[PDB]
Amino acid sequence: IQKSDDKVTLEERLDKACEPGVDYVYKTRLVKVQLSNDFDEYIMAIEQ
Amino acid sequence: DEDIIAEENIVSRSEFPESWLWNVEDLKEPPKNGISTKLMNIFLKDSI
Amino acid sequence: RAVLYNYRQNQELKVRVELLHNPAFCSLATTKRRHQQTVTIPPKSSLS
Amino acid sequence: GSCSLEGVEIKGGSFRLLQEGQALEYVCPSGFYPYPVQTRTCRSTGSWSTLKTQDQKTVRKAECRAIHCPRPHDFENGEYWPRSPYYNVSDEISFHCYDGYTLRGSANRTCQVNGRWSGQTAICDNGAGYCSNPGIPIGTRKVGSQYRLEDSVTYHCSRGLTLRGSQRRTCQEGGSWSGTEPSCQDSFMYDTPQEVAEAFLSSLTETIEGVDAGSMNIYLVLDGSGSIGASNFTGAKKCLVNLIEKVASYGVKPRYGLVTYATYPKIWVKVSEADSSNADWVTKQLNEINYEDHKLKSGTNTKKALQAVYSMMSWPDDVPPEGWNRTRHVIILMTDGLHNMGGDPITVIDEIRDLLYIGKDRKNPREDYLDVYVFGVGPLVNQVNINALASKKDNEQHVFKVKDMENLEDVFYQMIDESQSLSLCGMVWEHRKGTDYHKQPWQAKISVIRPSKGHESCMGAVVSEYFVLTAAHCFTVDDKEHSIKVSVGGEKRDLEIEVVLFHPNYNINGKKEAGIPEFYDYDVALIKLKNKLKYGQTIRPICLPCTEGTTRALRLPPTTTCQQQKEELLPAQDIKALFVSEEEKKLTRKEVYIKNGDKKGSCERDAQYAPGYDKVKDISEVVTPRFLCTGGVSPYADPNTCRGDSGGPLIVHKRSRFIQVGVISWGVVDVCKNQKRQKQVPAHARDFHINLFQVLPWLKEKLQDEDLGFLA
Numbered sequence: 001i002q003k004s005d006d007k008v009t010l011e012e013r014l015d016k017a018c019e020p021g022v023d024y025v026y027k028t029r030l031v032k033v034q035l036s037n038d039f040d041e042y043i044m045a046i047e048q
Numbered sequence: 049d050e051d052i053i054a055e056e057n058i059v060s061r062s063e064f065p066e067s068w069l070w071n072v073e074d075l076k077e078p079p080k081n082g083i084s085t086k087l088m089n090i091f092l093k094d095s096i
Numbered sequence: 097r098a099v100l101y102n103y104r105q106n107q108e109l110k111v112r113v114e115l116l117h118n119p120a121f122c123s124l125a126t127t128k129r130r131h132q133q134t135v136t137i138p139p140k141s142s143l144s
Numbered sequence: 145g146s147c148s149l150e151g152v153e154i155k156g157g158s159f160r161l162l163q164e165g166q167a168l169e170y171v172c173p174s175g176f177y178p179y180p181v182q183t184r185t186c187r188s189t190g191s192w193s194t195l196k197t198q199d200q201k202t203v204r205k206a207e208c209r210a211i212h213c214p215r216p217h218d219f220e221n222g223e224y225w226p227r228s229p230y231y232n233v234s235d236e237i238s239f240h241c242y243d244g245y246t247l248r249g250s251a252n253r254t255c256q257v258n259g260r261w262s263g264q265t266a267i268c269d270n271g272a273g274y275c276s277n278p279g280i281p282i283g284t285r286k287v288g289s290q291y292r293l294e295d296s297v298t299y300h301c302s303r304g305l306t307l308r309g310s311q312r313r314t315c316q317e318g319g320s321w322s323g324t325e326p327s328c329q330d331s332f333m334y335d336t337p338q339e340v341a342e343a344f345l346s347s348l349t350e351t352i353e354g355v356d357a358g359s360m361n362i363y364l365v366l367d368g369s370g371s372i373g374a375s376n377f378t379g380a381k382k383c384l385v386n387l388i389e390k391v392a393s394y395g396v397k398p399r400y401g402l403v404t405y406a407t408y409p410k411i412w413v414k415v416s417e418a419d420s421s422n423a424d425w426v427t428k429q430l431n432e433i434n435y436e437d438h439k440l441k442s443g444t445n446t447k448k449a450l451q452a453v454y455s456m457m458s459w460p461d462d463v464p465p466e467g468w469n470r471t472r473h474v475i476i477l478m479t480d481g482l483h484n485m486g487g488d489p490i491t492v493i494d495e496i497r498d499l500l501y502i503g504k505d506r507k508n509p510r511e512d513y514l515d516v517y518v519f520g521v522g523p524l525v526n527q528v529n530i531n532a533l534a535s536k537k538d539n540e541q542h543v544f545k546v547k548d549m550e551n552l553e554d555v556f557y558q559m560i561d562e563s564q565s566l567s568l569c570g571m572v573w574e575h576r577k578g579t580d581y582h583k584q585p586w587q588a589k590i591s592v593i594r595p596s597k598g599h600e601s602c603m604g605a606v607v608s609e610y611f612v613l614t615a616a617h618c619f620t621v622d623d624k625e626h627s628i629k630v631s632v633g634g635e636k637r638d639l640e641i642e643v644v645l646f647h648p649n650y651n652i653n654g655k656k657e658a659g660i661p662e663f664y665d666y667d668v669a670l671i672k673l674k675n676k677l678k679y680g681q682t683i684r685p686i687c688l689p690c691t692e693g694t695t696r697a698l699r700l701p702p703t704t705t706c707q708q709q710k711e712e713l714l715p716a717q718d719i720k721a722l723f724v725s726e727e728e729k730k731l732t733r734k735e736v737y738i739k740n741g742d743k744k745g746s747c748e749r750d751a752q753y754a755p756g757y758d759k760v761k762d763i764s765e766v767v768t769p770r771f772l773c774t775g776g777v778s779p780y781a782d783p784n785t786c787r788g789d790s791g792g793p794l795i796v797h798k799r800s801r802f803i804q805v806g807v808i809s810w811g812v813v814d815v816c817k818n819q820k821r822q823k824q825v826p827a828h829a830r831d832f833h834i835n836l837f838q839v840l841p842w843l844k845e846k847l848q849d850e851d852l853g854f855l856a
């Protein structure tokens with residue numbers, strides 16, 4: 001979406017996450033990076 | 049830029065038919081010299 | 097090919113031409129960026 | 145903290161602070177809309193949200209600009225005039241088709257103050273498709289020129305406009321497009337308080353009079369999110385109290401379900417209670433609710449609320465219930481469309497339609513068993529999200545957008561002043577006891593005993609509690625009332641009559657000077673019965689043209705004239721219709737086509753081959769404009785009427801309702817010999833009927849004391 005780096009914590013992060021378009025908020029961990037022709041695969045194991 | 053007509057203000061030409069003006073007219077005007085003249089107000093299409 | 101015609105007698109034109117964005121097509125025109133260039137057309141000529 | 149109000153004012157208007165100063169709403173005067181943004185959110189940086197358009201262009205200063213109606217950027221098979229880059233308020237454009245096309249809808253339309261065009265949508269149609277032309281609503285673009293069976297069309301609005309209605313419509317069996325007609329809405333169009341309750345009751349009464357037998361469930365969901373306010377909840381409580389008494393004013397007591405939600409769903413009244421059908425007990429629960437717990441859990445989790453509605457109607461391995469294929473479900477909810485928790489709520493809606501067996505069949509859609517109505521409370525409204533949740537039924541509206549809450553309370557006291565003319569005519573609900581006279585309740589069987597001439601077996605149609613409409617040539621002046629016996633509803637007994645009222649223009653032997661023995665012009669008659677008919681499951685009337693109940697049965701506005709109804713039921717095309725015939729002591733339907741378009745000429749000239757008419761000079765002398773023509777080979781092989789099916793109704797099935805438009809008169813070729821149907825019919829075997837739109841001043845006079853409500 002943007003480079004940001006402005007931080008501001010919840011005043012610039014909760015208001016973006018609580019917009020009606022935002023569906024999911026996850027915290028994940030990258031397991032395997034698979035380069036495969038047309039689309040690149042990033043396998044993320046869901047922690048919470 | 050700031051000069052020129054704004055692009056959102058321009059309404060584009062859209063009506064480009066190959067054939068139109070398929071109408072019936074009856075020459076009910078008073079006949080002078082055996083000739084009836086009907087004046088029609090028609091709207092020209094956007095084709096050049 | 098979008099051909100722009102300039103049928104003026106002795107007036108060269110400075111024109112900013114822009115392609116509008118459609119989600120059914122994939123070009124350089126996006127939702128947050130306009131695909132507009134400014135060209136110069138000499139009189140009694142055309143530019144593709 | 146609160147945002148600073150510097151550099152946020154608008155050129156030519158003021159503003160008001162909502163949500164405790166965390167959102168401003170621009171207030172332009174009447175006739176203007178705030179340029180792009182209607183409201184502004186207070187981001188937590190000290191400055192408000194930027195003046196971003198639908199194209200995300202940064203506008204420096206705001207200004208109230210003028211309201212324009214949406215321009216017609218696409219129109220086919222004709223010419224509209226004048227063409228303009230934009231249309232101001234109170235501008236008028238007119239429509240006119242090419243040669244060989246029929247214009248239906250409003251020919252003269254006017255842009256109103258609410259940014260919408262008046263009247264109905266103008267459509268140029270040739271009558272060559274199984275379905276009619278769905279047309280182009282103003283502001284849309286139609287993709288799909290084929291109007292055959294199983295075809296589809298897709299619609300798209302202009303730039304910066306939100307589609308309301310169905311994006312894709314499909315031609316179904318019977319000549320009716322799926323979904324609803326679209327209409328391009330904007331960020332400021334809203335709805336007037338009169339137009340909200342006018343369309344909402346005309347949808348609701350349709351799924352009430354079929355329940356008429358206790359077999360209807362109504363679900364009530366209310367949004368208690370923090371984006372609405374504590375002051376905007378108690379004004380919505382008093383609105384919902386007026387809704388229950390209007391439903392109970394029809395004699396039907398349904399089962400109610402009260403769930404208020406925010407972050408979590410809270411069930412106050414479940415439909416599986418012994419007191420949920422008592423309409424006065426649920427009203428007592430509505431004052432006892434308190435919204436202090438929903439204010440603590442400020443949020444908009446729409447998906448977890450609809451999962452509680454799914455758990456109320458689902459059965460835990462109960463194994464098909466008795467009302468699984470007979471219960472109408474009505475879901476009513478208010479929201480703002482701004483959901484941020486739980487996820488997409490549309491995935492719960494598709495699980496509900498799968499549980500109710502809706503869309504899982506091609507012969508039985510069952511769309512009348514689930515209606516979903518969504519109301520928009522505030523100016524902060526996502527019109528895309530509220531449109532995808534609501535149902536899309538034909539010629540009907542289910543999405544509403546209003547502002548300031550109090551006007552929505554104004555539509556609920558107005559709807560109880562509005563009286564709906566309930567119509568028990570043309571109602572056939574699918575009961576699993578499908579013997580005849582349940583599928584055709586209106587059909588009368590008339591028997592006239594004559595002295596050694598034989599028995600005259602004619603038919604008729606129940607039009608009221610006292611009158612039976614039939615043909616006039618079944619009776620003569622010599623036939624007395626004790627020798628005429630009429631049977632309805634499959635009953636073994638015969639009902640006795642009072643008088644047979646002939647039309648004053650009927651004269652069967654009025655052309656014997658010209659060599660014509662028969663003359664079936666104005667071949668209609670009424671039979672006033674001696675006893676009043678009691679309405680039940682096997683005896684019900686059939687609706688008639690140009691009445692109050694016919695206007696609501698077609699979902700038309702009440703300002704519909706009688707000439708506008710004749711453009712609707714009998715257009716200048718080939719019209720799909722049906723009549724009732726008796727096949728081996730059992731009643732059956734025969735679907736025919738009414739040749740009213742360009743094939744009306746080929747149908748009417750085949751009357752020369754009739755018996756006695758073989759030497760008639762002018763063919764229009766025996767076929768007056770009081771006639772309709774069915775049967776033949778083009779476009780299909782229509783079944784022909786017998787001599788025993790004479791006097792019956794010519795019915796048009798539209799939107800699960802049955803309207804009579806004609807009375808069966810005479811035929812050229814007798815294909816029925818009371819042995820079978822003659823399996824080799826000729827191609828000119830046409831049948832003629834009496835057009836009911838031409839005998840209206842006689843029908844209005846004889847039925848003036850019947851509570852039918854004929855139009856002026």
Ligand SMILES: *[C@@H]1O[C@H](CO)[C@@H](O[C@@H]2O[C@H](CO)[C@@H](O[C@@H]3O[C@H](CO)[C@@H](O)[C@H](O[C@H]4O[C@H](CO)[C@@H](O)[C@H](O)[C@@H]4O)[C@@H]3O)[C@H](O)[C@H]2NC(C)=O)[C@H](O)[C@H]1NC(C)=O
Binds near residue numbers: 469574575576
């Ligand atoms: C509510 O749901 C239930 C379950 O789906 C549903 O039950 C169905 O009932 C119909 C009758 O109303 C059944 O249809 C017939 O069933 C018999 C056997 O019982 C078959 O032999 C029949 O086939 C012949 O008859 C037809 C004409 O009657 C002919 O057209 C056909 O060619 C055959 O000659 C016929 O299928 C149906 O089988 C059941 N279905 C199940 C799964 O039990 C019930 O009707 C629903 N209620 C309502 C009001 O719809």
Ligand SMILES: *[C@@H]1O[C@H](CO)[C@@H](O[C@@H]2O[C@H](CO)[C@@H](O[C@@H]3O[C@H](CO)[C@@H](O)[C@H](O)[C@@H]3O)[C@H](O)[C@H]2NC(C)=O)[C@H](O)[C@H]1NC(C)=O
Binds near residue numbers: 238251252
């Ligand atoms: C829809 O509205 C239009 C007007 O907006 C109606 O048109 C009116 O039609 C009548 C014909 O009966 C016109 O009368 C004739 O006008 C011509 C003008 O050239 C004149 O030469 C003739 O002698 C005759 O008087 C009338 O002018 C016209 N109205 C206007 C304002 O021009 C139309 O009838 C409406 N249709 C429906 C279905 O409501």
Ligand SMILES: *[C@@H]1O[C@H](CO)[C@@H](O)[C@H](O)[C@H]1NC(C)=O
Binds near residue numbers: 230231
């Ligand atoms: C509509 O109003 C604008 C406002 O100035 C005006 O310029 C225009 O001529 C009017 N008429 C049309 C057809 O646009």
